[PDB]
Amino acid sequence: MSLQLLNPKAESLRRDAALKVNVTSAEGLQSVLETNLGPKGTLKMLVDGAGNIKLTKDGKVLLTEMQIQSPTAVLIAR
Amino acid sequence: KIIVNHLGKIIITNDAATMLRELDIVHPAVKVLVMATEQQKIDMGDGTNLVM
Amino acid sequence: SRSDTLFLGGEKISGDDIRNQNVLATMAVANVVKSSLGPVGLDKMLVDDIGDFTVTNDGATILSLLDVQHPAGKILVELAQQQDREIGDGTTSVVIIASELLKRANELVKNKIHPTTIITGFRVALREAIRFINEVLSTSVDTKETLINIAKTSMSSKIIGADSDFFSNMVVDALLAVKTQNSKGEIKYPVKAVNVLKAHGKSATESLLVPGYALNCTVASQAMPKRIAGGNVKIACLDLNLQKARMAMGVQINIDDPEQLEQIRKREAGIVLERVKKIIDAGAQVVLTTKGIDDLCLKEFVEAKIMGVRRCKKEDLRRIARATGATLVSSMSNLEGEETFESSYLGLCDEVVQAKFSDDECILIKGTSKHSSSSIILRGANDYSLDEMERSLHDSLSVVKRTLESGNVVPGGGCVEAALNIYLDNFATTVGSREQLAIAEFAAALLIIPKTLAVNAAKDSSELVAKLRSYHAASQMAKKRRSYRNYGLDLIRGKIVDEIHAGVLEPTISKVKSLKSALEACVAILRIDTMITVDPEPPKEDPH
Amino acid sequence: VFMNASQERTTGRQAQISNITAAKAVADVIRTCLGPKAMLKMLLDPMGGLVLTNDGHAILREIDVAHPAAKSMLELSRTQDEEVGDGTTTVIILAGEILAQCAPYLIEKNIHPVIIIQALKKALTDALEVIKQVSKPVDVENDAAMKKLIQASIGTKYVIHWSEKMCELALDAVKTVRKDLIDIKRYVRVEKIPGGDVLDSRVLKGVLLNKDVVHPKMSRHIENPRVVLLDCPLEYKKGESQTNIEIEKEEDWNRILQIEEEQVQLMCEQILAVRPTLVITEKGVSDLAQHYLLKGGCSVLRRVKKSDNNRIARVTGATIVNRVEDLKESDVGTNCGLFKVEMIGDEYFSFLDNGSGKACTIMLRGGSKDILNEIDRNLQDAMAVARNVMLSPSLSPGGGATEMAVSVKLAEKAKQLEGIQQWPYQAVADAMECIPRTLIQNAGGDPIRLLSQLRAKHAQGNFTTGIDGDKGKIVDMVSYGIWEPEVIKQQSVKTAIESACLLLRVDDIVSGVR
Amino acid sequence: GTLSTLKSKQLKEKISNIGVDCLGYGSNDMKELFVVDPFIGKKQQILLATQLCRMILKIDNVIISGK
Amino acid sequence: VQIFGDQVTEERAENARLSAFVGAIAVGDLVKSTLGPKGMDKLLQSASSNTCMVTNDGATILKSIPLDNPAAKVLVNISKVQDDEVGDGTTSVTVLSAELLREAEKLIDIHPQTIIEGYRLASAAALDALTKAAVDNSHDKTMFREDLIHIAKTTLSSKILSQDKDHFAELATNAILRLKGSTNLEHIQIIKILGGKLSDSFLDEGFILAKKFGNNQPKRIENAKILIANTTLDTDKVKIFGTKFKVDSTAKLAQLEKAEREKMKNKIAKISKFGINTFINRQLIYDYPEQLFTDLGINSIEHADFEGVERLALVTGGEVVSTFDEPSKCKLGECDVIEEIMLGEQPFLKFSGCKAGEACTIVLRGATDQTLDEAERSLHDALSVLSQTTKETRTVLGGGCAEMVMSKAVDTEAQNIDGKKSLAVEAFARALRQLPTILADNAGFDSSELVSKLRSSIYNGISTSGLDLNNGTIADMRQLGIVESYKLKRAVVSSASEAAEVLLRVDNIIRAR
Amino acid sequence: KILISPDGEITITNDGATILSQMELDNEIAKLLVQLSKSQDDEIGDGTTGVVVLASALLDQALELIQKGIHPIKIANGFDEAAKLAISKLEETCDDISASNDELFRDFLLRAAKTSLGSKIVSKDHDRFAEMAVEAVINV
Ligand SMILES: Nc1ncnc2c1ncn2[C@@H]1O[C@@H](COP(=O)(O)OP(=O)(O)O)[C@@H](O)[C@H]1O
Ligand SMILES: Nc1ncnc2c1ncn2[C@@H]1O[C@@H](COP(=O)(O)OP(=O)(O)O)[C@H](O)[C@H]1O
Ligand SMILES: Nc1ncnc2c1ncn2[C@@H]1O[C@@H](COP(=O)(O)OP(=O)(O)O)[C@H](O)[C@H]1O
Ligand SMILES: Nc1ncnc2c1ncn2[C@@H]1O[C@H](COP(=O)(O)OP(=O)(O)O)[C@H](O)[C@@H]1O
Ligand code: BEF
Ligand code: BEF
Ligand code: BEF
Ligand code: BEF
């Protein structure tokens, strides 16, 4: 009923929740690129919607070639 | 009496030959007395009601 | 927006929209039956959405068949059926007054008047309005002659209007002649009335009144006499249900050692007949039960040539026994020990003949010990009419009762409703200021009726009402009589005419109970400004 | 079997009452906006209409009513803005209120419309006289007579707080054209600039416009310049008809090239031989077209809006000349006192200041894109009340006054003329109070006490006495700066009633299908 | 209107009898015009609205779940 | 019934007020956390481009929000309005509104259309006093620069780039200096590249065109005398057009030589013009740079329209029309031209000492490819404030001084009118009083006790003062250098109580889908 | 106000403590408001409506308070302090200047209902109602 708007299909992750969604994803891109540093590190095989295979340890590679929807994440990916 | 065209236009008249002009009838019999008033308004201006 | 509570299905309208929706909802139920009233008025037909029809001019019954959607409308329907209780007639009209009171009241708050001021503007105009009735109705206490006038005015604006004069007396006479009771030192005519039937087919005018009741029943066995007349007849209204007899429940029957299952089988029937005879032995010219007689107990009432009626109307055997002096017996036992019956229980009539009325036959009971029995058996073309003819009856019988139960009567025909119109506004407007504009509308709202009595006639009648004004205003003002007032509308022929000079006359009571309740209804809605309407209980429709 | 299935018909009292009481709808909505305590409305048509104009027309246009007896009001209004600017709202009030007070007779009757119709038909033309009696041009005649007739109009609009400015604003532009003693009401130009405020609206005493560019090195401003209204494309626009250049020989191409170049090269020089400072054309020159003229110190112009350039010649006295090779020296416009490019909002306007020039272009600034427009339409209702204040120096003492005065007249005549014509006479009479009614209801001061005391006085005199809520109570609107042009009050009644009878001339209504 | 004028009559006559009377359409004395209500009436009302506000004001978060 | 055809909704009176008053504040609470360096930025994701914007700019913060409500979308206009006219403060231009009308809402318990009369007359008294307290001068370019920096600073603060506040405040005040008063801010283009770090964002006295010299040519230039040619270095042909048919077979024997020659006139026309470098609107055929490279003439094919002029108005060398028609008299006096070596593509350069000025305030910030945007729009918010002071010498102190002086002044008048319209006045003040209050929320100081504290000081001092966000002392803004231009803080005030008017007059509405 | 029951019954009444209950509510807190209205009825029996319009103003200004860095809890008891002062001031205003009569005087007991009887559907018919109530109570 309200509307209360704002608008439909839109959402306001505000304040601390914003603080969450903000922080709570930045380190998300951690567990993804953690492997790459250190000579003892290991690589990652990336697939896509076009049925292709990438197995390389570079980060720009594992961050550009990724699908992410949390601003901070994409931001660090940037 | 007001009449709203099949196109939505609004029309008001006293003339009976026009009332029917804007009216979509179905009755083959009524069609006749309508053809009358209409087949007069053209030949003679007034008198379209005394027809019907 | 909102948030407020609570949707969906639960909503509320505010101030203006409601005060309007309320007025519209009232003019709705009102404007439908606004044609009915007045001799010039007609009847209507309502369809049972299954083909079935029902022709009626009654406003009450007509509004019931409408269905009354909404609180404001149904509120009028409720006010309608109130009128029958007060009176019996005018239901068609009371609704109008009310509706007009709101219509105008709101048209005042729409002028930023505020309801409180208005709700009082009526509160007062009403009291003073009755104070004017004190001048009109009083002179109508003295004027059987003027009783047939009231019963006749209850015919017009009705189907039986064409045969008014004829049925005018059939109405009066049954109540006046044969319908009087007395409870706790009070004399009154049946507010539950006197049995009236309908005869399919036959002549209009030839509706047979009866010098007795008309119990609608058929002879139990064909072997019984179809009539027993002469004089001093033995009537018996027995609600004993003397048909058969089965063991008293909870009293099981286990036999042994016999060989005696038969020794009491008949004994079960014996005790029945033993009571049947005990009653037949006191008179038994005619037996009238409510429960019913049995085939194995009719043969006994048959051989004795005693007319027996299986399972009659309980509401009848009472009214019948009350006139024949009999006593509607309940249980056989009278004190202990008693069988029992006493010739002092039987009734006193003259004829008990089972008449015929077109593919149908009902038993009549002519003459009684106490001469108080009347039954009007109508007769017309179709059920469609013969029923409505009864509506005009139930609605006319009443007008008389109310009259004969209150010495004061009133010059109807738009007369009273006209005097008030002029009298309050010209003479009520002492307070002035704003309250005046209220009183004013309360008087103006009264013209609503006289108006429609005229508008009912296709012809321009805007003037016929204008005259009724100047005339009535003449009683006092403006700018030893002879009083030139007290006239009224002659809908039949255009132009004013003294109503008292005419058969027309309505019971004062009717002009009050209707003027009063029409106000309360109006008020109750005036106070309204917000209608919260919460949705009902929906079907589970659970996705799980 | 006729009639065709299906098309609705209302024969009887139905259309007779369900058209008046149906017209009353739209006439019940607008009946709140009028006068000092105004009630402006907002509405979102299909898509984001988001428009808030108090112009009764502007309102009744968005309702897009579909009902016949209602689209009559959306018509009886539309006309107003053709004859008289303001008053558009007040017409409907009566237009309906009449229909309204026609119900009582029509219902307790037993009275054919024809009777009611002519019954008002008289009262109408009767009132038209009383009005023509009151206007008086011009006791204390002054150029302020128009100015205060506008403060009666702008009053109670979305500009009233800042109105004394938008007052002198309107008058000025109006008095720039030769309509005194005839001239259009178009020449004043109303421009829309994004950001800003009502108070920050500029009254350019010349022209205004923006245009596409290709090189900014041009001079941004020039004092007392020479302006050529060219109207041509110079880049290299292809010939109208199928223009082609078939060739022969090796060394001819270049000849054609240098020829083409030459053709335009010349035209450009031609402009120079006019000694202008700013070339303003209605078509497109881009590229070298600008380049050269800019080197000479002239701000080239992209084709200037049609109705734009048509203002510039008159202000500058120049005459638009679609031909370049016959450009005379008496066709240019120098009237421009100072032409600059002072940037405003997110845009950049080229204003030609300065005057002896007809189109007093107004560059109206706003704070909201839905308000800049509510001010525009809030001056169209003014500039016109000014125009009519000039055309006829006859002024009606408005403010619910001319109404309360007409009423007493009609009410006076009706009594002598008693009969079935007395009521309908006392109709337009009573219904004439429609204005002073909610005119006060909107404010708040008690209306009933006010008119019961206004009539009680206006009746014994006070012929031009209206309801002035400035101090509460009521007084002669003739003393205060309350002046409504004649045409408004007069023409409106004749119009509001024209429909107040048409909708009674109605028997039934027959519809159609899609 | 009446509020302002009540403030005065309040400070002047210790709001002892002054108030708003709908009938009088102004500001006469409640007692003078026999307008009376029990001492509990308006005292047991405040005690509630306050102890109530407390409750509501103590609320910081609303979650839902089957009780 | 009709009407025009439902489904159409209709809201009138009481609720239509709340839903609008409460409807606006809805926007205001979120909007406010953007005042003073203790200010926040909000993220804004766009459906389509699926890229997000992070910055804090009231105009953009709301211009990037899909909002259904008319009363809200309305505010979103106010912001997008001041941003245009003024440039800064847009973040707050609504704050005083939502509060203002929330005030009006409570006051509405009392006719509305009259409340507008107060807020337009009483906040006019405020508007007046604020002019009185204003401090003009000086007009010596010696003093100006020191004020403009203080302005750019106070504005550039609270924006991601505040870190090196000076670094930017300098960027701004410079580009503003060039082009006297008052000139359009459309010639100085803010170009941005994704380059490692922050503060590597210098101001450029030339242009930074995208294009890189054609072929294997020199990357630098001495005593640059560039050339502004228009026509492409290709064999010409009339625009009307024509066809050339080789009727003669021997005609081609000469036609072929006509080719190489009809463009060799480009080289001859170049050396003769004394020009050293070149660049053309339209493109040049591979048959040209070849000749250019051997000669050492530099090739710069294709340049944007507005860039063709930037390179021009930089050296004032006139935009040449067609090759060989160009006078050596017209040439570009460029100090230098180089190819900066960014990752991937590298832009060319047109440095100028004056210069000229067609500033290009290029900003890098590799740190975050979406911070440049976040930043280069704050540099702007600076620029447009450093300009308003030139056009309007008037300036006033912030930190809550602005509102303090008004609410203080307005305050007295309200107690004098002793009119219902007068209470209106008092709110107009309490709305302003709200701005500093809110400014405290963010810094951390208690509001209630901070305004009362602040209002006493205006009396002791009057009207210099304000509330310190960070530095101690609760010191006067003139001391701490916390000031912004005066006309800006006017438009803000008026422009708000404007929408406060229109929006407070609506009463009823009608909405379709 | 008219109240259409979820069942169907119609209610028209001035008892705001019944009116509030009748009008379905969602917000759990709004619900709270209902009981505090139904309380004044079980306690005193009047002012079922007035107490609600109070619970508003208070909560509505505690709004204004929180909005200015005033702690909720500080307002809770902070208000409750003004509560006990109000319920006490009510005596210092009826000790005193006005009245506190309980018996032997109908001139007031009736006038208590006359005001009480007044301002309801029975406004017009109260005379009989007012006295009747008083008499029907004072005798128990
Ligand atoms: N006094 C009158 N003057 C003119 N026409 C009248 C007068 N009285 C009645 N009428 C009617 O008006 C005309 C007919 O109405 P009309 O709608 O024009 O029918 P039609 O156009 O088919 O002839 C006359 O011929 C007549 O019947
Ligand atoms: N002959 C009459 N002429 C004018 N008015 C009459 C006449 N008879 C009755 N009335 C008035 O108008 C009547 C309207 O009919 P009504 O009684 O309401 O419905 P019904 O008669 O069908 O029950 C009243 O009963 C009465 O007061
Ligand atoms: N250093 C400061 N100390 C106190 N108040 C300040 C200071 N700097 C700015 N302010 C105030 O708070 C600011 C809020 O920022 P604003 O220009 O409105 O939008 P944004 O910060 O997003 O560009 C005001 O413009 C100003 O008066
Ligand atoms: N033999 C080694 N012993 C210890 N540290 C090493 C050794 N060789 C390399 N490192 C260091 O370990 C780190 C991690 O590698 P890193 O730079 O993160 O690779 P990348 O950045 O491409 O993911 C140093 O940067 C560096 O390479
Ligand atoms: F006008 Be008529 F009827 F032809
Ligand atoms: F009025 Be009657 F009874 F229909
Ligand atoms: F107002 Be800031 F520059 F966003
Ligand atoms: F609530 Be009141 F006493 F009817």
Tab-separated table of C-alpha atoms and ligand atoms in Angstrom, chain G residues 14 46 49 119, ligand 8:
chain	number	residue	atom	x	y	z
G	14	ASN	CA	-19.551	7.827	19.266
G	46	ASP	CA	-15.564	7.937	29.909
G	49	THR	CA	-11.660	8.944	22.906
G	119	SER	CA	-22.457	15.137	22.849
H	8	BEF	F1	-17.221	9.863	24.679
H	8	BEF	BE1	-18.330	10.608	24.968
H	8	BEF	F2	-18.519	10.622	26.318
H	8	BEF	F3	-19.415	10.051	24.356
